[PDB]
């Protein structure tokens, strides 16, 4: 068939357009591999140091408010 | 069924057929290289083994620890290579546990660890990945053998399992022991020998651990690269046997649609 | 709308990753939380014949699995879990289902009130 | 008739020693027993408003107290244990609460089967 212009010839991207067994085995392998790359690129994206400082403080502020509460409690009791 | 369904399934087994032809010539030129590089690594592999045959050495009655070294690749598409060595490792562990020995195993491939991840996830020591892409060399036999010592696990016997091939067609999964302990290598057949102490035999018995791994790494990359040649050859015969049977059904259905829509025009004009 | 919107989005991520039938990598913590939740959500959608459930009873089945109260059970027993749990709600907790129907929406007082009964059931159902 | 003939007698022996219970620990072990068993049977007979019971269900609850399967418990845990013993035996043993409602008399083939329910529930209760 293919050894003439008349007969049917296959192009590029014909395993996914069929939608069979190999067309489903290819979609679940591009997803189960690029799911782990959304893990390693997101875990190392938390290693920004400026965010950790900001978080060094939010916590600090929270703790200082607790201290403020306690100090008021003492004031009352006294 | 329809004409649009036959054509799309027919084109998809053209691409699968053309790719397995391309992946036959690629993994056959990787086979001829691994056949030339084996013969210098054969006698160097035979000579490092050759000391133990000219001595009656055996692990006599009972020893407390063990190592199994599973040797495979990080690649698939090779038939029953990985399934055979995974079958031999389960046979030996279930037999040695009758003698009460504690066994720790180590896999130098991905697909050894991936198979045994369920039943034996707590008997692993270390696992070595990225093996089999580039050809193996002696430096990688030294990286593995160094980390087998400086781990904290002091063992006293062991064995290695790998696929020593006989020909292009037939390989064989085989078994070879590793006398790693100095005192089991201190028997009647060494008292005939010369001034070797327990420090010289300590340095020597370590070096033969790196020479059994390099022997194992060269036979197994030839056993694997020949089975990739055969298993990519039957995947192009079965995809070309399937490609003629869909060509006849495409040609019956191509004629039947020109015949069918010719009757509808004639019947539309005759009733008018 | 408050309980099925996060059920549809947990099935859509299940169909994309569960088409293999040949797994080689064990992603046990990565995707096996996602790929073994959608198995439970699918078997929650099976039904018999000539048995139309009420609308407020339907919420008490979907909410039992979308927030993750079924992730311990065996997959062969999820249909046995439901026809025992369907009896325990329709008999002893009628005024709870009278609030979900008459209001038309689930609220925060009803949300934690619905949280306890599924935990007392699961602590008593298993043998 | 079978269980209350042991019950009406033993709640009658508690009434004679009911004065000793206020300031008592230096008594005999027999008198300290009637203060024990008689206060479990009093806790069984409590009952909430507008909840009538079926007859063969009451023969389950009263069989637990008068036979000896409640002495090792705390008296505020009696009125919890009864409610948890009933909901286990309605659902998972409905075939044996119709073998008393039909036969009428507790045969020995049922007197040996309720021994394997109460003791196999008294283990997995206190949690």
Swiss-Prot record, chain A:
Localisation: Mitochondrion
Record's keyword terms, sorted: Coiled coil, Mitochondrion, Transit peptide
A Gene Ontology cellular-component term: protein-containing complex
Annotated positions of the N6-succinyllysine modification: 78
Chief location: mitochondrion
Keyword Transit peptide: yes
A GO MF term: identical protein binding
Disordered as annotated region, ranges: 1-23
Biological process annotations from GO: erythrocyte differentiation; heme biosynthetic process; mitochondrial depolarization; negative regulation of endothelial cell proliferation; negative regulation of hydrolase activity; negative regulation of mitochondrial ATP synthesis coupled proton transport; positive regulation of mitochondrial outer membrane permeabilization involved in apoptotic signaling pathway; positive regulation of proteolysis involved in protein catabolic process
Coiled-coil region: 44-78
S-S bridge residues: none
Spans annotated as Antiparallel alpha-helical coiled coil region: 49-78
Region (N-terminal inhibitory region): 1-27
Self-association and partners: Homodimer; represents the active form and is present at a pH value below 6.5. Homotetramer; represents the inactive form and is present at a pH value above 7.0.
Note on domains (UniProt): Forms an alpha-helical dimer with monomers associated via an antiparallel alpha-helical coiled coil composed of residues 74-106, leaving each N-terminal inhibitory region (residues 26-52) accessible for interaction with an F1 catalytic domain. The inhibitory N-terminal region (residues 26-52) binds the alpha(ADP-bound)-beta(ADP-bound) (ATP5F1A-ATP5F1B) interface of F1-ATPase, and also contact the central gamma subunit (ATP5F1C).
Family affiliation: Belongs to the ATPase inhibitor family.
Function: Endogenous F(1)F(o)-ATPase inhibitor limiting ATP depletion when the mitochondrial membrane potential falls below a threshold and the F(1)F(o)-ATP synthase starts hydrolyzing ATP to pump protons out of the mitochondrial matrix. Required to avoid the consumption of cellular ATP when the F(1)F(o)-ATP synthase enzyme acts as an ATP hydrolase. Indirectly acts as a regulator of heme synthesis in erythroid tissues: regulates heme synthesis by modulating the mitochondrial pH and redox potential, allowing FECH to efficiently catalyze the incorporation of iron into protoporphyrin IX to produce heme.
Name of the molecule in the record: ATPase inhibitor, mitochondrial
Native species: Sus scrofa
Gene that this sequence comes from: ATP5IF1
From Swiss-Prot, chains C, D:
Expressing tissues: Expressed in heart (at protein level).
Superkingdom of this protein's organism: Eukaryota
Residues reported in the UniProt entry to bind ATP: 47, 49
TM segment ranges: none
Modification sites for N6-succinyllysine: 1, 72, 80, 105, 113
Location of N6-acetyllysine modifications: 1, 8, 72, 80, 105, 113, 115
Compartments where located: Mitochondrion; Mitochondrion inner membrane; Cell membrane
Post-translational modification: Acetylated on lysine residues. BLOC1S1 is required for acetylation.
Known role: Subunit alpha, of the mitochondrial membrane ATP synthase complex (F(1)F(0) ATP synthase or Complex V) that produces ATP from ADP in the presence of a proton gradient across the membrane which is generated by electron transport complexes of the respiratory chain. ATP synthase complex consist of a soluble F(1) head domain - the catalytic core - and a membrane F(1) domain - the membrane proton channel. These two domains are linked by a central stalk rotating inside the F(1) region and a stationary peripheral stalk.
Family note: Belongs to the ATPase alpha/beta chains family.
Subunit structure: Homotrimer. Component of the ATP synthase complex composed at least of ATP5F1A/subunit alpha, ATP5F1B/subunit beta, ATP5MC1/subunit c (homooctomer), MT-ATP6/subunit a, MT-ATP8/subunit 8, ATP5ME/subunit e, ATP5MF/subunit f, ATP5MG/subunit g, ATP5MK/subunit k, ATP5MJ/subunit j, ATP5F1C/subunit gamma, ATP5F1D/subunit delta, ATP5F1E/subunit epsilon, ATP5PF/subunit F6, ATP5PB/subunit b, ATP5PD/subunit d, ATP5PO/subunit OSCP.
Something else known: The siderophore enterobactin (Ent) produced by enteric bacteria binds Fe(3+) and helps bacteria scavenge iron ions from the environment. As a consequence, the mammalian siderocalin LCN2 plays an important role in defense against bacterial infections by sequestering iron bound to microbial siderophores. LCN2 can also bind iron bound to endogenous or nutrient-derived iron chelators and plays an important role in cellular iron homeostasis.
Protein name in UniProt: ATP synthase F(1) complex subunit alpha, mitochondrial
Organism per entry: Sus scrofa
Gene expressing this chain: ATP5F1A
């Amino acid at each position: 068939s293919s050894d003439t212009p008349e007969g049917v010839r296959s192009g590029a991207g014909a395993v996914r357009d069929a939608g069979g067994a190999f067309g489903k085995k290819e979609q679940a392998d591009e997803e189960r591999y690029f799911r782990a790359r959304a893990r390693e690129q997101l875990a190392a994206l938390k290693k920004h140091h400026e965010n950790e400082i900001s978080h060094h403080v939010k916590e600090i502020e929270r703790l200082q408010k607790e201290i403020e509460r306690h100090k008021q409690s003492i004031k009352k009791l006294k | 069924a329809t004409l649009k369904d036959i054509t799309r399934r027919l084109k998809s087994i053209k691409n699968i057929q053309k790719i397995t032809k391309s992946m036959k010539m690629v993994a056959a030129a990787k086979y001829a290289r691994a056949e030339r590089d084996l013969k210098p690594a054969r006698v160097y592999g035979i000579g490092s083994l050759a000391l133990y045959e000219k001595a009656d050495i055996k692990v006599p009655e009972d020893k407390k620890k063990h190592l199994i070294i599973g040797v495979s690749s990080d690649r698939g598409l090779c038939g029953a290579i990985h399934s055979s060595v995974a079958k031999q490792i389960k046979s030996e562990v279930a037999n040695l546990t009758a003698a009460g020995k504690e066994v720790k195993i180590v896999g130098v491939g991905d697909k050894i660890r991936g198979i045994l991840h369920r039943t034996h996830s707590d008997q692993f020591l270390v696992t070595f990945k990225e093996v089999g892409r580039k050809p193996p060399t002696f430096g990688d036999a030294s990286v593995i053998a160094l980390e087998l010592l400086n781990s904290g696990y002091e063992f006293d016997e062991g064995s290695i399992i790998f696929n020593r091939f006989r020909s292009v067609i037939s390989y064989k999964t085989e078994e070879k022991p590793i006398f790693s302990l100095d005192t089991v290598a201190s028997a009647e057949s060494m008292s005939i020998y010369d001034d070797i102490d327990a420090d010289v035999l300590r340095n020597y018995q370590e070096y033969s651990l790196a020479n059994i791994i390099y022997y194992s790494l060269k036979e197994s990359t030839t056993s694997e690269q020949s089975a990739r040649m055969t298993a990519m050859d039957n995947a192009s015969k079965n995809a070309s046997e399937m490609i003629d049977k869909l060509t006849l059904t495409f040609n019956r259905t191509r004629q039947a649609v020109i015949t069918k829509e010719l009757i509808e025009i004639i019947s539309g004009a005759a009733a008018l | 709308k408050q309980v099925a919107g996060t059920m549809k989005l947990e099935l859509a991520q299940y169909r994309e990753v569960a088409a293999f039938a040949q797994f080689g990598s064990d992603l046990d913590a990565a995707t096996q939380q996602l790929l073994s939740r959608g198995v439970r959500l699918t078997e929650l959608l099976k039904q018999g014949q000539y048995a139309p459930m009420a609308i407020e009873e339907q919420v008490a089945v979907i909410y039992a699995g979308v927030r993750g109260y079924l992730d311990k059970l065996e997959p062969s027993k999820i249909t046995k879990f439901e026809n025992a749990f369907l009896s325990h709600v329709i008999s002893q907790h009628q005024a709870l289902l009278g609030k979900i129907r008459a209001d038309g929406k689930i609220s925060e007082e009803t949300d934690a009130k619905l949280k306890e009964i599924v935990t007392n059931f699961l602590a008593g159902f298993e043998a």
